Design a protein around this ligand. Structure first.
Ligand code: HEM
Ligand SMILES: COc1ccc(C(=O)O)cc1
Ligand SMILES: [Cl-]
Length: 393
Protein backbone atom coordinates (compact mmCIF):
# COMPACT_ATOMS: atom_id res chain seq x y z
CA UNK A 1 0.00 0.00 0.00
CA UNK A 2 2.62 2.52 1.12
CA UNK A 3 5.98 2.51 -0.71
CA UNK A 4 9.10 2.07 1.41
CA UNK A 5 12.09 4.22 0.47
CA UNK A 6 15.72 4.03 1.58
CA UNK A 7 16.38 7.72 0.86
CA UNK A 8 17.94 9.50 3.84
CA UNK A 9 16.72 13.13 3.60
CA UNK A 10 19.23 14.10 6.32
CA UNK A 11 22.30 12.74 4.51
CA UNK A 12 25.01 15.01 3.14
CA UNK A 13 24.42 13.44 -0.28
CA UNK A 14 20.76 14.51 -0.11
CA UNK A 15 21.60 18.03 1.08
CA UNK A 16 24.08 18.47 -1.78
CA UNK A 17 21.33 18.06 -4.39
CA UNK A 18 17.88 17.27 -2.95
CA UNK A 19 15.72 17.91 -5.99
CA UNK A 20 15.93 14.56 -7.84
CA UNK A 21 15.30 12.67 -4.60
CA UNK A 22 12.36 14.99 -3.84
CA UNK A 23 10.76 14.10 -7.17
CA UNK A 24 11.32 10.44 -6.31
CA UNK A 25 9.55 11.00 -2.98
CA UNK A 26 6.69 12.88 -4.66
CA UNK A 27 6.19 10.39 -7.49
CA UNK A 28 6.39 7.28 -5.28
CA UNK A 29 3.00 8.21 -3.81
CA UNK A 30 1.18 10.76 -1.65
CA UNK A 31 2.49 9.00 1.49
CA UNK A 32 5.82 7.15 1.73
CA UNK A 33 7.59 5.26 4.49
CA UNK A 34 11.25 6.14 5.11
CA UNK A 35 12.90 2.94 6.35
CA UNK A 36 16.07 4.78 7.41
CA UNK A 37 14.31 6.57 10.28
CA UNK A 38 10.94 4.76 10.67
CA UNK A 39 8.78 7.78 9.81
CA UNK A 40 6.12 8.58 7.26
CA UNK A 41 6.83 11.20 4.62
CA UNK A 42 4.71 13.55 2.55
CA UNK A 43 6.39 15.45 -0.28
CA UNK A 44 3.52 16.66 -2.49
CA UNK A 45 1.98 20.07 -1.88
CA UNK A 46 -1.51 18.69 -1.25
CA UNK A 47 -0.55 16.36 1.60
CA UNK A 48 1.92 18.80 3.17
CA UNK A 49 -0.79 21.47 3.19
CA UNK A 50 -3.33 19.03 4.64
CA UNK A 51 -1.02 17.91 7.46
CA UNK A 52 -0.08 21.49 8.34
CA UNK A 53 -3.76 22.47 8.58
CA UNK A 54 -4.92 19.61 10.86
CA UNK A 55 -3.04 20.39 14.10
CA UNK A 56 -5.38 18.20 16.16
CA UNK A 57 -4.49 15.04 14.24
CA UNK A 58 -0.90 16.01 13.37
CA UNK A 59 0.27 17.58 16.62
CA UNK A 60 3.43 19.52 17.51
CA UNK A 61 3.50 19.06 21.30
CA UNK A 62 5.28 15.73 20.82
CA UNK A 63 8.07 17.57 18.99
CA UNK A 64 8.48 18.85 15.42
CA UNK A 65 11.79 17.02 15.07
CA UNK A 66 12.36 13.31 14.71
CA UNK A 67 12.38 12.84 18.49
CA UNK A 68 9.00 11.95 20.03
CA UNK A 69 8.70 13.85 23.32
CA UNK A 70 6.46 11.10 24.69
CA UNK A 71 9.39 8.66 24.32
CA UNK A 72 12.54 10.82 24.75
CA UNK A 73 13.44 13.91 26.74
CA UNK A 74 13.68 17.08 24.62
CA UNK A 75 17.22 18.37 24.28
CA UNK A 76 15.98 21.67 25.75
CA UNK A 77 12.74 22.68 27.49
CA UNK A 78 9.98 22.70 24.87
CA UNK A 79 9.19 25.92 23.05
CA UNK A 80 6.01 27.49 24.41
CA UNK A 81 4.79 28.17 20.84
CA UNK A 82 6.49 25.90 18.28
CA UNK A 83 6.23 22.73 20.38
CA UNK A 84 2.76 23.36 21.82
CA UNK A 85 -0.74 22.57 20.56
CA UNK A 86 -3.98 24.53 20.90
CA UNK A 87 -5.13 25.66 23.40
CA UNK A 88 -1.75 25.99 25.19
CA UNK A 89 -0.34 27.38 21.93
CA UNK A 90 -2.95 30.11 21.59
CA UNK A 91 -2.02 32.77 24.14
CA UNK A 92 1.78 32.68 23.59
CA UNK A 93 1.09 32.84 19.85
CA UNK A 94 -1.12 35.90 20.37
CA UNK A 95 1.64 37.64 22.35
CA UNK A 96 4.29 37.05 19.69
CA UNK A 97 1.78 38.10 17.02
CA UNK A 98 1.37 41.46 18.76
CA UNK A 99 5.09 41.85 19.51
CA UNK A 100 5.88 41.26 15.81
CA UNK A 101 2.69 42.89 14.54
CA UNK A 102 1.95 44.91 11.39
CA UNK A 103 1.96 48.04 13.56
CA UNK A 104 5.37 47.13 15.02
CA UNK A 105 6.89 46.92 11.54
CA UNK A 106 6.29 50.67 11.15
CA UNK A 107 8.55 51.42 14.13
CA UNK A 108 11.54 49.49 12.71
CA UNK A 109 11.18 49.85 8.92
CA UNK A 110 13.20 53.05 8.46
CA UNK A 111 16.17 51.76 10.46
CA UNK A 112 16.12 48.36 8.74
CA UNK A 113 16.06 50.05 5.33
CA UNK A 114 18.88 52.45 6.25
CA UNK A 115 21.07 49.54 7.37
CA UNK A 116 20.39 47.62 4.15
CA UNK A 117 21.20 50.64 1.97
CA UNK A 118 24.35 51.27 4.02
CA UNK A 119 25.50 47.65 3.76
CA UNK A 120 25.08 47.60 -0.03
CA UNK A 121 26.97 50.89 -0.28
CA UNK A 122 29.77 49.39 1.83
CA UNK A 123 29.91 46.22 -0.27
CA UNK A 124 30.07 48.21 -3.52
CA UNK A 125 33.25 49.87 -2.22
CA UNK A 126 34.81 46.40 -1.94
CA UNK A 127 33.41 45.09 -5.24
CA UNK A 128 34.28 41.42 -4.70
CA UNK A 129 32.56 40.05 -1.59
CA UNK A 130 31.15 36.88 -0.05
CA UNK A 131 27.38 37.35 -0.26
CA UNK A 132 26.91 34.97 2.68
CA UNK A 133 29.30 36.23 5.37
CA UNK A 134 29.41 39.82 4.09
CA UNK A 135 25.73 40.29 3.22
CA UNK A 136 23.28 37.49 4.03
CA UNK A 137 24.81 37.04 7.49
CA UNK A 138 26.11 40.56 8.05
CA UNK A 139 22.82 42.35 7.37
CA UNK A 140 20.47 40.45 9.76
CA UNK A 141 23.19 40.59 12.42
CA UNK A 142 23.26 44.38 12.00
CA UNK A 143 19.52 44.91 12.65
CA UNK A 144 17.85 42.01 14.45
CA UNK A 145 19.94 41.74 17.67
CA UNK A 146 19.50 45.48 18.17
CA UNK A 147 15.76 45.13 17.54
CA UNK A 148 15.68 42.34 20.13
CA UNK A 149 17.36 44.67 22.61
CA UNK A 150 20.42 42.45 23.12
CA UNK A 151 23.64 43.82 24.55
CA UNK A 152 26.69 43.75 22.30
CA UNK A 153 28.76 41.26 24.32
CA UNK A 154 28.14 37.63 23.42
CA UNK A 155 26.40 38.08 20.06
CA UNK A 156 28.86 35.60 18.54
CA UNK A 157 26.69 32.91 20.19
CA UNK A 158 23.59 33.77 18.13
CA UNK A 159 24.42 32.05 14.84
CA UNK A 160 25.82 28.91 16.57
CA UNK A 161 22.69 28.63 18.72
CA UNK A 162 20.37 28.96 15.71
CA UNK A 163 22.32 26.32 13.80
CA UNK A 164 22.14 24.02 16.82
CA UNK A 165 18.36 24.44 17.18
CA UNK A 166 17.79 23.46 13.56
CA UNK A 167 20.27 20.58 13.63
CA UNK A 168 18.49 19.31 16.76
CA UNK A 169 15.22 18.86 14.86
CA UNK A 170 17.04 16.24 12.81
CA UNK A 171 17.64 12.58 13.49
CA UNK A 172 20.43 11.44 15.81
CA UNK A 173 23.10 11.65 13.09
CA UNK A 174 26.56 13.19 13.37
CA UNK A 175 25.32 16.69 12.47
CA UNK A 176 22.95 16.65 15.45
CA UNK A 177 25.21 14.97 18.01
CA UNK A 178 28.15 17.25 17.24
CA UNK A 179 25.92 20.32 17.59
CA UNK A 180 24.58 19.21 20.97
CA UNK A 181 28.13 18.28 22.04
CA UNK A 182 29.17 21.93 21.59
CA UNK A 183 25.93 23.48 22.81
CA UNK A 184 26.54 24.39 26.46
CA UNK A 185 28.10 27.89 26.07
CA UNK A 186 25.50 28.98 23.50
CA UNK A 187 22.65 27.63 25.65
CA UNK A 188 23.97 29.53 28.67
CA UNK A 189 24.30 32.83 26.82
CA UNK A 190 20.85 32.58 25.22
CA UNK A 191 19.01 31.62 28.41
CA UNK A 192 20.61 34.50 30.31
CA UNK A 193 19.65 37.12 27.71
CA UNK A 194 16.01 36.00 28.04
CA UNK A 195 15.73 37.57 31.50
CA UNK A 196 13.92 40.92 31.67
CA UNK A 197 16.89 43.01 32.96
CA UNK A 198 19.04 42.03 29.96
CA UNK A 199 16.61 43.19 27.24
CA UNK A 200 16.89 46.86 26.32
CA UNK A 201 13.81 49.11 26.50
CA UNK A 202 11.59 49.20 23.44
CA UNK A 203 12.94 46.04 21.80
CA UNK A 204 11.18 42.76 21.07
CA UNK A 205 12.39 41.11 24.27
CA UNK A 206 11.20 43.90 26.56
CA UNK A 207 7.87 43.95 24.72
CA UNK A 208 7.34 40.25 25.44
CA UNK A 209 8.01 40.84 29.14
CA UNK A 210 5.66 43.84 29.05
CA UNK A 211 2.81 41.49 28.07
CA UNK A 212 3.05 39.56 31.35
CA UNK A 213 0.64 42.23 32.71
CA UNK A 214 -2.36 41.33 30.56
CA UNK A 215 -3.20 37.77 31.56
CA UNK A 216 -1.97 36.40 28.24
CA UNK A 217 1.34 35.10 29.64
CA UNK A 218 2.74 34.97 33.16
CA UNK A 219 6.13 36.48 34.09
CA UNK A 220 7.63 32.99 34.35
CA UNK A 221 6.56 32.28 30.74
CA UNK A 222 8.30 35.32 29.24
CA UNK A 223 11.93 34.04 29.24
CA UNK A 224 11.10 30.95 27.17
CA UNK A 225 9.04 33.09 24.77
CA UNK A 226 12.03 35.41 24.31
CA UNK A 227 14.04 32.24 23.65
CA UNK A 228 11.80 31.63 20.63
CA UNK A 229 13.05 34.84 18.98
CA UNK A 230 16.66 33.89 19.79
CA UNK A 231 16.16 30.46 18.18
CA UNK A 232 14.08 31.34 15.12
CA UNK A 233 14.59 34.22 12.75
CA UNK A 234 18.32 34.53 12.20
CA UNK A 235 19.40 31.45 10.25
CA UNK A 236 16.27 31.21 8.07
CA UNK A 237 16.41 34.89 7.13
CA UNK A 238 20.15 34.65 6.44
CA UNK A 239 19.54 31.64 4.20
CA UNK A 240 16.57 33.33 2.51
CA UNK A 241 18.52 36.48 1.71
CA UNK A 242 21.47 34.40 0.49
CA UNK A 243 19.14 32.40 -1.73
CA UNK A 244 17.68 35.59 -3.19
CA UNK A 245 21.15 36.88 -4.05
CA UNK A 246 22.07 33.46 -5.45
CA UNK A 247 18.98 33.50 -7.68
CA UNK A 248 19.60 37.06 -8.87
CA UNK A 249 23.15 35.96 -9.71
CA UNK A 250 22.03 32.82 -11.57
CA UNK A 251 19.00 34.42 -13.30
CA UNK A 252 20.27 37.82 -14.50
CA UNK A 253 17.02 38.42 -16.40
CA UNK A 254 15.22 38.55 -13.05
CA UNK A 255 17.73 41.01 -11.61
CA UNK A 256 17.09 43.14 -14.68
CA UNK A 257 13.32 43.05 -14.09
CA UNK A 258 13.87 43.88 -10.42
CA UNK A 259 16.11 46.83 -11.28
CA UNK A 260 13.43 47.99 -13.72
CA UNK A 261 10.73 47.89 -11.00
CA UNK A 262 12.16 47.90 -7.45
CA UNK A 263 8.64 47.54 -6.01
CA UNK A 264 8.98 43.86 -6.97
CA UNK A 265 11.49 43.53 -4.11
CA UNK A 266 8.97 42.08 -1.66
CA UNK A 267 7.72 39.43 -4.08
CA UNK A 268 11.27 38.74 -5.25
CA UNK A 269 12.10 37.74 -1.67
CA UNK A 270 8.88 35.74 -1.28
CA UNK A 271 9.76 33.86 -4.46
CA UNK A 272 13.23 33.17 -3.06
CA UNK A 273 11.60 31.70 0.05
CA UNK A 274 9.50 29.39 -2.12
CA UNK A 275 12.37 28.56 -4.49
CA UNK A 276 14.96 27.76 -1.77
CA UNK A 277 12.68 27.09 1.23
CA UNK A 278 15.26 27.84 3.95
CA UNK A 279 13.27 25.61 6.31
CA UNK A 280 13.21 22.35 4.35
CA UNK A 281 11.34 20.04 6.72
CA UNK A 282 9.30 19.79 9.90
CA UNK A 283 7.74 16.80 11.66
CA UNK A 284 4.32 16.19 13.14
CA UNK A 285 3.11 13.31 15.33
CA UNK A 286 -0.22 11.58 14.83
CA UNK A 287 -2.60 11.65 17.80
CA UNK A 288 -4.89 9.01 16.27
CA UNK A 289 -5.08 6.57 13.41
CA UNK A 290 -5.61 8.73 10.34
CA UNK A 291 -6.28 8.28 6.63
CA UNK A 292 -3.94 10.50 4.60
CA UNK A 293 -3.93 10.22 0.82
CA UNK A 294 -5.36 6.70 0.77
CA UNK A 295 -2.90 5.45 3.41
CA UNK A 296 -3.67 4.49 7.01
CA UNK A 297 -1.19 5.89 9.55
CA UNK A 298 -1.35 4.66 13.14
CA UNK A 299 -1.36 6.72 16.31
CA UNK A 300 1.91 8.08 17.64
CA UNK A 301 3.74 8.04 14.29
CA UNK A 302 6.13 10.72 13.08
CA UNK A 303 5.21 12.40 9.79
CA UNK A 304 7.96 14.25 7.92
CA UNK A 305 6.74 17.19 5.82
CA UNK A 306 8.95 18.21 2.88
CA UNK A 307 8.20 21.93 2.68
CA UNK A 308 10.80 22.60 0.01
CA UNK A 309 9.42 19.73 -2.05
CA UNK A 310 5.84 20.98 -1.68
CA UNK A 311 7.06 24.37 -2.93
CA UNK A 312 8.39 22.72 -6.12
CA UNK A 313 5.55 20.25 -6.70
CA UNK A 314 4.47 20.53 -10.38
CA UNK A 315 1.00 19.35 -9.31
CA UNK A 316 0.69 22.81 -7.75
CA UNK A 317 3.27 25.10 -9.42
CA UNK A 318 3.83 26.17 -13.01
CA UNK A 319 7.54 25.77 -13.87
CA UNK A 320 8.40 25.12 -10.20
CA UNK A 321 12.20 25.21 -10.62
CA UNK A 322 12.20 28.61 -12.35
CA UNK A 323 12.87 31.71 -10.24
CA UNK A 324 10.15 34.19 -11.23
CA UNK A 325 9.85 37.42 -9.24
CA UNK A 326 6.33 38.07 -10.57
CA UNK A 327 5.03 34.60 -9.66
CA UNK A 328 1.82 34.47 -7.63
CA UNK A 329 3.48 32.90 -4.58
CA UNK A 330 0.44 32.94 -2.27
CA UNK A 331 -0.01 29.43 -0.89
CA UNK A 332 3.65 28.38 -0.68
CA UNK A 333 4.53 26.63 2.57
CA UNK A 334 8.02 28.08 3.12
CA UNK A 335 6.61 29.85 6.19
CA UNK A 336 4.37 26.90 7.04
CA UNK A 337 0.59 27.21 6.98
CA UNK A 338 -2.18 27.26 9.56
CA UNK A 339 -2.04 28.00 13.29
CA UNK A 340 1.76 27.72 13.45
CA UNK A 341 2.49 29.72 10.27
CA UNK A 342 5.63 31.76 10.85
CA UNK A 343 4.79 34.38 13.46
CA UNK A 344 7.88 36.36 12.48
CA UNK A 345 7.06 36.40 8.76
CA UNK A 346 6.58 40.17 8.78
CA UNK A 347 10.10 40.64 10.16
CA UNK A 348 11.58 38.21 7.62
CA UNK A 349 9.77 39.85 4.71
CA UNK A 350 10.85 43.31 5.88
CA UNK A 351 14.53 42.34 6.04
CA UNK A 352 14.37 40.57 2.69
CA UNK A 353 12.45 43.39 1.01
CA UNK A 354 14.68 46.27 2.09
CA UNK A 355 17.84 44.35 1.15
CA UNK A 356 16.55 43.42 -2.31
CA UNK A 357 15.37 47.03 -2.60
CA UNK A 358 18.89 48.35 -1.97
CA UNK A 359 20.34 45.92 -4.52
CA UNK A 360 17.63 46.83 -7.05
CA UNK A 361 18.50 50.52 -6.76
CA UNK A 362 22.30 50.36 -6.37
CA UNK A 363 23.62 47.28 -8.22
CA UNK A 364 23.80 46.74 -11.98
CA UNK A 365 25.18 43.18 -12.02
CA UNK A 366 25.84 40.29 -9.63
CA UNK A 367 28.33 37.75 -10.98
CA UNK A 368 29.52 34.63 -9.18
CA UNK A 369 33.31 34.83 -9.25
CA UNK A 370 34.39 32.01 -6.94
CA UNK A 371 33.56 28.52 -5.70
CA UNK A 372 30.04 28.23 -4.30
CA UNK A 373 30.00 26.23 -1.06
CA UNK A 374 26.92 24.71 0.55
CA UNK A 375 26.11 24.83 4.27
CA UNK A 376 24.81 21.59 5.78
CA UNK A 377 22.11 21.49 8.45
CA UNK A 378 19.52 18.83 9.27
CA UNK A 379 16.64 21.28 8.76
CA UNK A 380 17.97 24.35 6.93
CA UNK A 381 18.98 24.76 3.29
CA UNK A 382 21.45 27.53 2.54
CA UNK A 383 24.90 28.45 1.32
CA UNK A 384 28.16 28.65 3.26
CA UNK A 385 30.00 30.91 0.79
CA UNK A 386 28.85 32.85 -2.28
CA UNK A 387 31.68 34.85 -3.89
CA UNK A 388 30.20 37.55 -6.11
CA UNK A 389 31.37 40.71 -7.82
CA UNK A 390 28.92 43.60 -7.42
CA UNK A 391 28.84 46.15 -10.25
CA UNK A 392 27.41 49.54 -9.25
CA UNK A 393 24.53 51.02 -11.19
C1 HEM B 1 12.81 33.52 5.65
C2 HEM B 1 12.70 33.47 6.99
C3 HEM B 1 11.85 32.43 7.76
C4 HEM B 1 11.40 31.22 7.39
C5 HEM B 1 11.64 30.48 6.06
C6 HEM B 1 10.63 30.68 8.49
C7 HEM B 1 9.99 29.45 8.55
C8 HEM B 1 9.07 29.05 9.50
C9 HEM B 1 8.20 27.89 9.42
C10 HEM B 1 8.15 26.89 8.25
C11 HEM B 1 7.45 27.84 10.53
C12 HEM B 1 6.37 26.77 10.84
C13 HEM B 1 6.75 25.85 11.99
C14 HEM B 1 5.79 24.69 12.07
O1 HEM B 1 4.78 24.69 11.31
O2 HEM B 1 6.01 23.76 12.89
C15 HEM B 1 7.82 28.98 11.36
C16 HEM B 1 7.30 29.32 12.60
C17 HEM B 1 7.87 30.24 13.46
N1 HEM B 1 8.75 31.25 13.11
FE1 HEM B 1 9.62 31.47 11.28
N2 HEM B 1 10.62 31.61 9.51
C18 HEM B 1 11.36 32.70 9.09
C19 HEM B 1 11.59 33.84 9.82
C20 HEM B 1 11.29 34.02 11.15
C21 HEM B 1 11.58 35.20 11.92
C22 HEM B 1 12.31 36.43 11.34
C23 HEM B 1 11.14 34.98 13.18
C24 HEM B 1 11.20 35.91 14.41
C25 HEM B 1 11.43 37.23 14.35
C26 HEM B 1 10.53 33.66 13.21
C27 HEM B 1 9.94 33.05 14.30
C28 HEM B 1 9.08 31.96 14.25
C29 HEM B 1 8.36 31.35 15.36
C30 HEM B 1 8.42 31.81 16.84
C31 HEM B 1 7.64 30.33 14.88
C32 HEM B 1 6.71 29.40 15.69
C33 HEM B 1 5.28 29.88 15.41
C34 HEM B 1 4.24 28.94 15.96
O3 HEM B 1 4.56 27.76 16.26
O4 HEM B 1 3.07 29.38 16.10
N3 HEM B 1 10.64 33.11 11.95
N4 HEM B 1 8.81 29.68 10.70
C1 LIG C 1 10.59 27.50 12.55
O1 LIG C 1 11.79 27.57 13.26
C2 LIG C 1 11.61 27.75 14.64
C3 LIG C 1 12.61 27.36 15.51
C4 LIG C 1 12.44 27.54 16.87
C5 LIG C 1 11.27 28.10 17.36
C6 LIG C 1 11.09 28.29 18.86
O2 LIG C 1 12.09 28.16 19.62
O3 LIG C 1 9.95 28.56 19.33
C7 LIG C 1 10.26 28.49 16.48
C8 LIG C 1 10.44 28.31 15.12
CL1 LIG D 1 18.53 26.27 25.06
Amino acid sequence: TIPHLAIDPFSLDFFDDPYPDQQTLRDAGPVVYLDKWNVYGVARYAEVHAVLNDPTTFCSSRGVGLSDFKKEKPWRPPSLILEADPPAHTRPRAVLSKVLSPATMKTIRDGFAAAADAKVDELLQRGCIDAIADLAEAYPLSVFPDAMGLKQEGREHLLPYAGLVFNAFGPPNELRQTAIERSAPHQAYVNEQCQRPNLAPGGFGACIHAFTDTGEITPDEAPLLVRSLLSAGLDETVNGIGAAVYCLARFPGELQRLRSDPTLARNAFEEAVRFESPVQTFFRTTTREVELGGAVIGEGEKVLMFLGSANRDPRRWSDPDLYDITRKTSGHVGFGSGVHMCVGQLVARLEGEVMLSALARKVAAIDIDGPVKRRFNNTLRGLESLPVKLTPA
